[PDB]
Amino acid sequence: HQVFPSFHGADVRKTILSHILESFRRKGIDPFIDNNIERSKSIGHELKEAIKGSKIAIVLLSKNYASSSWCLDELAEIMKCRELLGQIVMTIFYEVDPTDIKKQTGEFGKAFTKTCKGKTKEYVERWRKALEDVATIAGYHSHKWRNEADMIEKIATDVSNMLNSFKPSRDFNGLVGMRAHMDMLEQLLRLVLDEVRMIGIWGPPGIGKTTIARFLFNQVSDRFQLSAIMVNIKGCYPRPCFDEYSAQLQLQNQMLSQMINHKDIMISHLGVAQERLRDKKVFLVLDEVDQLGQLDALAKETRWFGPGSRIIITTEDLGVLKAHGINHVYKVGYPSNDEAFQIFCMNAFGQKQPHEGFDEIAREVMALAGELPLGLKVLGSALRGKSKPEWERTLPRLKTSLDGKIGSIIQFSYDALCDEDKYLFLYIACLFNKESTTKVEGLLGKFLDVRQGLHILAQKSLISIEDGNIYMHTLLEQFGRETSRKQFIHHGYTKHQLLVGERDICEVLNDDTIDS
Amino acid sequence: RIWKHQVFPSFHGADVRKTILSHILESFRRKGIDPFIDNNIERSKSIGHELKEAIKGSKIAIVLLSKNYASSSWCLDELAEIMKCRELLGQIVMTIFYEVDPTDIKKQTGEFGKAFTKTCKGKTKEYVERWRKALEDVATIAGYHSHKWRNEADMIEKIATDVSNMLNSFKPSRDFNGLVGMRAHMDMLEQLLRLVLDEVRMIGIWGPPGIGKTTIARFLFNQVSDRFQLSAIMVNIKGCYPRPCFDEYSAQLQLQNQMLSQMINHKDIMISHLGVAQERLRDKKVFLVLDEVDQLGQLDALAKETRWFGPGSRIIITTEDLGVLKAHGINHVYKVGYPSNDEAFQIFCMNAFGQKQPHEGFDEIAREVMALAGELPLGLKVLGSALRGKSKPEWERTLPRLKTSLDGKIGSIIQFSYDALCDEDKYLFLYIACLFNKESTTKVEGLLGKFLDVRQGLHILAQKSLISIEDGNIYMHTLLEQFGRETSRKQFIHHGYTKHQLLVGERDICEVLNDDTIDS
Amino acid sequence: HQVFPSFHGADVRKTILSHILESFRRKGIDPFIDNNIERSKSIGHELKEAIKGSKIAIVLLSKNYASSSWCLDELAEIMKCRELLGQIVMTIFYEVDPTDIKKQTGEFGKAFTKTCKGKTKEYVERWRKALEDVATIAGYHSHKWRNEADMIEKIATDVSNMLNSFKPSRDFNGLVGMRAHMDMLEQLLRLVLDEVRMIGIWGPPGIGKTTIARFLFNQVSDRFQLSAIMVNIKGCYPRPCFDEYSAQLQLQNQMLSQMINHKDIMISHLGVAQERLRDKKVFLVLDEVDQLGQLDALAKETRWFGPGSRIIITTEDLGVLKAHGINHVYKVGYPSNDEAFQIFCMNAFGQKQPHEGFDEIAREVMALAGELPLGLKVLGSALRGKSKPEWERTLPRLKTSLDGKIGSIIQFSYDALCDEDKYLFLYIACLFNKESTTKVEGLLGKFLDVRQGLHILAQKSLISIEDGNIYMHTLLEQFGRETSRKQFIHHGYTKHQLLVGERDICEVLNDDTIDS
């Protein structure tokens, strides 16, 4: 069920229960509807089991709720299921004071005394224990509320809100390999050291930093007193921030309103966050941080968050993390080949890791995707619902041009570079993909300042140097070779363009309109 | 006549202001009715005169009659005023007898009579007479008896429906009255919906831009949504969605948040995971319309499986790209077709002259402008509105302006559809618009084969409803070809490392060769 | 004063009046503070005159308000000033039922009876008439309010809101010549014909359409049951409106929320406006309408607004008005030379129409401004606070280049034209400013389609034809001659540029890099 409503027929069926059920119906809540199985008999099964299998229980208490052993038995069963099963019980006191229920006095007490005659001691004890337990739990009081329509709307909204958040997240079960990530993180977080440790997650664009951060939040946040997740801080921060202090103040306002649950917050100085969070454990996730000013706005000192706090900054360039003094940094790594194939098969064959007989083309497209979860997702989605001949016909375009879903993000990460860094990126893409860095310096050194360029590129994770050899991801080298057809390289100010396109150099070499 | 309030409710607040009047007022507010509420009387203003003026300026008076109605003096004074205004100003009076019968009202016996006697002790002699005569006048009206209904929600719904009918009796036309030839559309959709099959069919609606997929969706919703437990329509999903989409999950969460905030009447939902629509809509007959999806992230956020929804549900996705529908496994697809020539003229004339037929002497030039508009309802509407007030000479000397410049309201929409293509698809579109419009598919593949992958490009363009292949030859709508020939003057065609352009014109673009300034 | 508070010292001075005064103080409201002139004597003058000269009166009624002839005399004087002078009296019932005050029963009645012993009949009659008048006027009840802090905040907000709108507008007294405009309008409005007449105001950009509409609204709106003014509809309407129906629906939502005072309105169909406004007189001002769709969204038929309604559309092009069938159209005219000088002297010499000894330069700059109120305002503001030598030094730049404040608006009105209309505008600016239209057709007719071009230009009010001669305002011809240095004229596709700049043709003619 959705909701099991417990009430007294003679009191509320005509007047208020009808309105409550109408509000539930228009809010998409379907409560259990007893057919008057036994108007005055015992509850029996299929009325005990209905209580058992109800996500929410609603007790609607009125003056004669105690003048029917039926309702008293239902209440005792409801509270038993609240204790053992962990059911959610919401009380509505309709023209009855909770105090009159707890102590069973007044007209409610008179009715309860009249009912409990002839009944055995244990039954009466169960009934009154249930009653006094019910009267204490926080519900809705009819006398306090201005008018019934507002109270009913509030009750319906609250029930809807709990039904929305009743079950845990399961959309993250479609992810592959999160155990390696969580195991590498918990080595850094060290959740038992009650410091204010700050952790940095860094990696190439579209590798899984945001998904890792979300998964970590969903796992851990419940351990922390007050937690919030800031998503895409880079996007929501204006680039031409002519008055940076105003942007900083509103960014901290956003963080604070999201965290301490006061949506109506407007702050004056930048030290409000320290004032609020100094005495409470905080789990804060700052996602896609691009520059120091906004780190200062959100988390500038470990003194601000107080004991046991964990601040996790997911970023794309290492220089930001080093500047702010993080030191505990996680370098996200590409998934293994089998997990890459599982991701591709999620995104191409409908959440089915086994191949549907398209195993041959599936591996070629995977190898085309490098190892990025972004590339794998884009390539898989671009091919779902196809048939095998459609796969072969799509393959050449998918191979001679990367999808715009990847190109847009790589471009956004490529628009934050100095011009010499762009030129070094293009050179590494077209000519020096896997070459000793010393030879690259010996070849481009007269004009490119390669030693700073490689440093910046590696810090932004557009390159990685292993065993003294540079390496660029294939799905970035393709972007580079594409860009090398519409963009130039200026050394002093002369414009040079790299010529690497297969079957694209033939027609350019067979030309008279050239520049040599 | 002129009124200031639709409904004026007269009641005794000590009996009904908390319990039933609140529900009546919320129901009225939900049914688009604005009643007079005494709590909003502006402060520092005398209450009596404002109540009098509100009674006089109200179209409908509603009299809740409780057993303590006669105990107050405000109640009797405003009842007398209501009766006088009904007799003298033609206002409609409705009665509700809440837990008291008209027998006591009209004779002041026992219940409701003792209150009148205690309230009438210290008064004048004629006030008592006015109050009494008002009581008999109101008690002879036939209204609603509380004790004749098993529950009060149904009675309040009945009262609100009656009041809404009484207020909304004018109804000269609805927003869907200027539509032309949409019985044809609704017949073809009914074959696809099959509303008595208790499956969870998802139905696609695909057509070129400006073919009215949105109007068909709106009409179908306002016709069919009544019979489903829960229903929602989401309009222009393509426009609200982020274009680069740096974070897919947040966008999907927000889009499903909108869908649930409108489907469920929970106006401020904060979804935490994409699985809420699974858990809230799994046992309910649900009607859902997704007006313009562009890509498959929207579908995965809003309607991923038919298991998310309950038996009998219908989900209707309008789109321009057939690949999106095929990827999601729709298989029930309605390809919207251009209206007939007669209906197209009807739409053009409705937008130009305000009537289905042209004004005298306009027929020839009207049909010429029509032929210029192709067949798209969007083009017909735009060209018709562009000539709504003009006269014959303006038509005759604005037609050459129509031919040589695509209107902004059509060009912008076609531009939005064109900017979503790849680079090679854009180049193929420009080639087809400028050069190879009606030519063979085979010849186009033979000529443009070396520059780009022609066959897959044509397949994708047909998927996107930008071209159409009928008998081995490709086709473009006149408006699309016009847009392509215009954008040919600013767009560069990059084949390899080189760059090229297309020269299309009658005689005008031959002077560009005489520029002697730009590379050829 | 701001507010005169009437209260009883022994009841409310310690507890609630202190909080009320604190809220007033933090809201910037300064109430009269009696110094206990005569604690138990007569009120006398300087307590009667304080009541007389108070914009707002606040009566704070408590159980013992009637046990002091001081407070009763203050109340009688307050209500007398409410009747004659028209004072605003707000009542606060602090732990007293209004019914107990109207009928003077209960403990309030006991106190009032005890006070009224020994007093003469006329005094008692004045006191009780005042009391029963007070008890009826709509105030604030302590028993109904959830907590006192919220009630006090509401009272302070209401008093502040009335003090904000106590006086009528006077910022429109700085305008010159509005009587001619109002007299030309009232001939069109014909406010006694109880039709749904729709009026159009059209003119060149920056001539005063918006100011005329605002002045007319402020004068008339109070005659109308429900009125609203929509400002800059052109600006708030998206140009690339890919889904026009959504924009139309939100535009009607904006109008309706502004008009019927329901800020929380979300509408479904486009016929809501008819449903709401069919039975009430409405004064609606739609300002800066650019196209038919948004007229259809806001006001499509006269059936929608009901009897005695007046809809006023201020626009810049006549074709929109003719398309929608307005027929009653006002062509705003340039002000006379003396009013032009008064406007310039407002904007240059600080609201002082007499010249401050700069009469000579003031007339030259005026003549430079043509006659536009926009040009006059911009030129006057550009020269205020200067000295006469500063005027002579600024004058040449002010003469060889129009200010950007005018150029931006003229450009925005010039970006809505077809290319041939732009070319005809440029030709009229540089060569054919005051020429017979027949000769213009004979000269440009082979390529410009002049007869449609002049029609469109005149409809957009970028030109006017009088006695068969075209005429363009000087402050538009200057924009044209400026534009003729950075923009070309394409006839087939060859680019021609008009050469009219004084002392700017000498250096271009002394050149070898030309095109002939």
B297 phi-psi bin (left φ>0, alpha ψ -120 to 50, beta other): alpha
Q: How far is B190 from B201, CA to CA, in rounded Å?
A: 12
CA–centroid distance for A82 within its chain = 30
Q: ∠ at Cα B274 (B273, B278), nearest 5°?
A: 115
- Pick the residue from chain B with its C-alpha nearest to C323: B389
Query: H/E element holding C188?
Result: helix C178-189
Exposure of A262 by Cβ count < 10 A (0-12 exposed, 13-18 middle, 19+ buried)? exposed
- Pick the residue from chain A with its C-alpha nearest to B296: A381
Chain A residues within 8 A of B37 when measuring between CB atoms: none
Which of these is catalytic: B42, B50, B53, B78? B78
Paired tokens of A171: 């959309």
- Beta strands B202-206 and B333-335 are parallel
3-state secondary structure of A220: helix
A224 annotated as a binding-site residue? no
Query: H/E element holding C90?
Result: strand C88-93
Distances (CA, A) of C417 to C410, C425, C456, C473, C496: 12, 10, 9, 18, 19
- Pick the residue from chain A with its C-alpha nearest to B261: A27
Task: Check CB contact under 8 Å for C319 and B239.
Answer: no
Q: How far is B322 from B460, CA to CA, in rounded Å?
A: 9
Long-range contacts of C264-272 (CB under 8 A, 24+ apart): C269/B174, C269/B175, C270/B175, C270/C245, C270/C297, C271/B173, C271/B174, C271/B175, C272/B32
Positions at the binding site of B for ADP: 180, 210, 212-215, 248, 381
Residues paired with residue B8 on neighbouring β-strands, in sequence order: B61
Question: With a CB-CB cutoff of 8 Å, which residues 409-428 of chain A face chain B?
Answer: 409, 412
DSSP 8-state code for residue B130:
H
Q: How far is C223 from C186, CA to CA, in rounded Å?
A: 14
Count other Cβ atoms within 10 Å, centred on residue C103: 16
The Cα of C276 is separated from the nearest Cα of chain B by a number of Å equal to 9
- 8 Å CB contact between B251 and B297: yes
Residues 6 or more apart from B167 whose CB is under 8 A from it? B6, B7, B33, B59, B60
Chain C residues within 8 A of B1 when measuring between CB atoms: 279, 307
- Pick the residue from chain C with its C-alpha nearest to B509: C493
Q: How far is A327 from A325, CA to CA, in rounded Å?
A: 6
Report which of A71, A75, A80 is spatially closest to residue A12, judged by C-alpha positions.
A71
Chain C residues within 8 A of B47 when measuring between CB atoms: 136-138
- 8 Å CB contact between B319 and B204: yes
Paired tokens of C440: 């213009």
Question: With a CB-CB cutoff of 8 Å, which residues 1-20 of chain A face chain B?
Answer: 13-19
Which of B152, B249, B265 shows the shortest C-beta gap to A26? B265
Task: Check CB contact under 8 Å for B247 and A157.
Answer: no
The sign of the torsion formed by the CA atoms of C466, C467, C472, C473 equals negative
Helices (H) and strands (E) in chain B, counts: 24, 11
Q: ∠ at Cα A460 (A456, A464), nearest 5°?
A: 85
- Pick the residue from chain A with its C-alpha nearest to B22: A149
Q: How far is C52 from C43, CA to CA, in rounded Å?
A: 13
The sign of the torsion formed by the CA atoms of A256, A261, A262, A263 equals positive
Chain B residues within 8 A of A149 when measuring between CB atoms: 22-23, 25-26
Count other Cβ atoms within 10 Å, centred on residue A132: 14
A9 annotated as a binding-site residue? yes
Strands, sheet with B5-10, edge to edge from the N-terminal-most edge strand: B5-10, B58-65, B92-97, B144-145
Q: How far is A462 from A459, CA to CA, in rounded Å?
A: 8
A244 annotated as a binding-site residue? yes
Distance between start and end Cα atoms, chain A: 78
Q: Does B296 touch chain A (CB under 8 A)?
A: yes
- Pick the residue from chain B with its C-alpha nearest to A16: B152
The sign of the torsion formed by the CA atoms of C342, C347, C353, C356 equals negative
Q: Does B274 touch chain A (CB under 8 A)?
A: yes
- 8 Å CB contact between B104 and B112: yes
Q: How far is A182 from A168, CA to CA, in rounded Å?
A: 18
Please report the beta strands in A280-343, taking only residues with DSSP state E, as ranges in sequence order.
Answer: 282-289, 310-315, 328-331
- Pick the residue from chain B with its C-alpha nearest to A511: B498
3-state secondary structure of B96: strand
Task: Check CB contact under 8 Å for B275 and A169.
Answer: yes
Q: Does C516 touch chain B (CB under 8 A)?
A: no
Report which of C176, C174, C185, C194 is spatially closest to residue C216, judged by C-alpha positions.
C185
Paired tokens of A360: 């041959």
Paired tokens of C5: 């508070």
Exposure of B517 by Cβ count < 10 A (0-12 exposed, 13-18 middle, 19+ buried)? exposed
Paired tokens of B29: 């507010």
DSSP 8-state code for residue A480:
H
Residues 6 or more apart from C54 whose CB is under 8 A from it? C1, C2, C3, C4, C32, C87
Q: Does B154 touch chain A (CB under 8 A)?
A: yes
Q: Does A405 touch chain B (CB under 8 A)?
A: yes
Report which of A31, A24, A37 is spatially closest to residue A1, judged by C-alpha positions.
A31
Task: Identify the residue whose tokens are 């001679």.
Answer: A400
- Beta strands B58-65 and A464-466 are unpaired
- Beta strands A282-289 and A226-230 are parallel
DSSP 8-state code for residue A433:
S
Q: Determination method here?
A: cryo-EM
Phi/psi at A56 (nearest 5 deg)? -125, 145
DSSP 8-state code for residue C102:
H
Which of these is catalytic: A46, A74, A288, A477? A74
Paired tokens of B491: 């767009």
How many residues make up chain A in this entry? 516
- 8 Å CB contact between A384 and A377: no
Task: Check CB contact under 8 Å for A14 and B496.
Answer: no
A137 annotated as a binding-site residue? yes
Paired tokens of A514: 């050239």
Task: Check CB contact under 8 Å for B413 and C242.
Answer: yes
Q: How far is B249 from C296, CA to CA, in rounded Å?
A: 39
3-state secondary structure of B41: coil
3-state secondary structure C14-77: CCHHHHHHHHHHHCCCCECCCCCCCCCCCCCCCCHHHHHCCCEEEEEECCCCCCCHHHHHHHHH
3-state secondary structure of A394: helix
Task: Check CB contact under 8 Å for A508 and B495.
Answer: no
Distances (CA, A) of B218 to A212, B189, B194, B336, C207: 41, 13, 18, 14, 43
Radius of gyration of chain C (CA): 32
Phi/psi at B7 (nearest 5 deg)? -130, 135
DSSP string computed for B193-215: H-TTS-S--EEEEE-STTS-HHH
Any alpha helices (H) in B90-205, and if so which ranges? 102-107, 113-119, 126-139, 152-167, 183-193
Report which of A322, A359, A325 is spatially closest to residue A344, judged by C-alpha positions.
A359
Chain C residues within 8 A of B214 when measuring between CB atoms: 243, 245
Task: Check CB contact under 8 Å for A393 and B455.
Answer: yes
Q: ∠ at Cα B104 (B102, B105), nearest 5°?
A: 60
Q: How far is A16 from A23, CA to CA, in rounded Å?
A: 11
Chain B residues within 8 A of A167 when measuring between CB atoms: 275, 279
Q: Does B253 touch chain C (CB under 8 A)?
A: no
3-state secondary structure of B141: coil
Tell me the residue type at A451: R
Chain B residues within 8 A of C260 when measuring between CB atoms: 34
Q: Does A147 touch chain B (CB under 8 A)?
A: yes
Chain A residues within 8 A of B496 when measuring between CB atoms: 485, 501, 504-505, 507-508
Q: How far is A108 from A128, CA to CA, in rounded Å?
A: 12
Count other Cβ atoms within 10 Å, centred on residue A195: 12
Which of A167, A214, A486 shows the shortest C-beta gap to B249? A214
Query: H/E element holding A8?
Result: none
3-state secondary structure A18-64: HHHHHHHHHCCCCECCCCCCCCCCCCCCCCHHHHHCCCEEEEEECCC
Phi/psi at A3 (nearest 5 deg)? -140, 140
How many residues make up chain C in this entry? 516
Q: Does C168 touch chain B (CB under 8 A)?
A: no
Residues 6 or more apart from C8 whose CB is under 8 A from it? C60, C62, C64, C65, C67, C68, C71
Chain A residues within 8 A of B519 when measuring between CB atoms: 513
Q: Does B392 touch chain C (CB under 8 A)?
A: no
Long-range contacts of C185-193 (CB under 8 A, 24+ apart): C185/C212, C185/C216, C185/C330, C188/C328, C188/C330, C189/C220, C189/C310, C191/C220, C191/C223, C191/C308, C191/C310
A305 annotated as a binding-site residue? no
Q: How far is C488 from A452, CA to CA, in rounded Å?
A: 48
Any alpha helices (H) in B209-281, and if so which ranges? 213-224, 237-240, 248-263, 276-280
Residues 6 or more apart from C39 whose CB is under 8 A from it? C9, C70
Question: With a CB-CB cutoff of 8 Å, which residues 352-391 of chain B face chain C?
Answer: 385, 388-390
Exposure of B428 by Cβ count < 10 A (0-12 exposed, 13-18 middle, 19+ buried)? buried
Question: With a CB-CB cutoff of 8 Å, which residues 208-247 of chain B face chain A?
Answer: 229-230, 244-247
Q: Does C106 touch chain B (CB under 8 A)?
A: no
Strands, sheet with A226-230, edge to edge from the N-terminal-most edge strand: A226-230, A282-289, A310-315, A198-202, A328-331
Helix, strand, coil in percent for chain A, rounding step 5: 50, 10, 40
Q: Does A508 touch chain B (CB under 8 A)?
A: yes
Distances (CA, A) of B249 to A314, A404, A408, B255, B274: 16, 18, 17, 10, 9
Report which of A304, A312, A342 is spatially closest to residue A329, judged by C-alpha positions.
A312
Question: Resolution of this entry in Å?
Answer: 3.0
Q: How far is C297 from C294, CA to CA, in rounded Å?
A: 5
3-state secondary structure of A79: helix
- 8 Å CB contact between A484 and A430: yes
Tell me the residue type at A222: D
Chain C residues within 8 A of B59 when measuring between CB atoms: 279
Question: With a CB-CB cutoff of 8 Å, which residues 335-354 of chain C face chain B?
Answer: none
- 8 Å CB contact between C494 and B514: yes
CA–centroid distance for C148 within its chain = 37
Distances (CA, A) of B435 to A396, B149, B410, B440, C463: 26, 75, 22, 12, 42
Any alpha helices (H) in A190-271, and if so which ranges? 209-220, 233-236, 244-259
Neighbours of C (≥3 Cβ pairs closer than 8 A)? B
Q: How far is C305 from C276, CA to CA, in rounded Å?
A: 9
Paired tokens of B286: 């649900």
Count other Cβ atoms within 10 Å, centred on residue B382: 23
Q: How far is B160 from B157, CA to CA, in rounded Å?
A: 5
- 8 Å CB contact between A419 and A490: yes
Maximum Cα interatomic distance, chain C, rounded to a whole number of Å: 113
Which of B326, B327, B497 shows the shortest C-beta gap to A485? B497
Phi/psi at B156 (nearest 5 deg)? -65, -40
Angle between helices B377-385 and B341-352 (to 10 degrees): 30
Task: Check CB contact under 8 Å for B230 and A163.
Answer: no
Neighbours of A (≥3 Cβ pairs closer than 8 A)? B
- 8 Å CB contact between C17 and C61: no
- Pick the residue from chain B with its C-alpha nearest to A26: B265
Exposure string for A71-90, b = 16+ CB within 10 A, e = fewer: bbbbbbbbbbbbeeeebbbb
For residue B510, the number of C-alpha atoms closer than 13 Å in the C-beta half-sphere is 4
The sign of the torsion formed by the CA atoms of A411, A417, A420, A421 equals negative
- 8 Å CB contact between A67 and A108: no
Exposure of C63 by Cβ count < 10 A (0-12 exposed, 13-18 middle, 19+ buried)? middle
Any alpha helices (H) in B286-390, and if so which ranges? 296-302, 322-327, 341-352, 363-372, 377-385
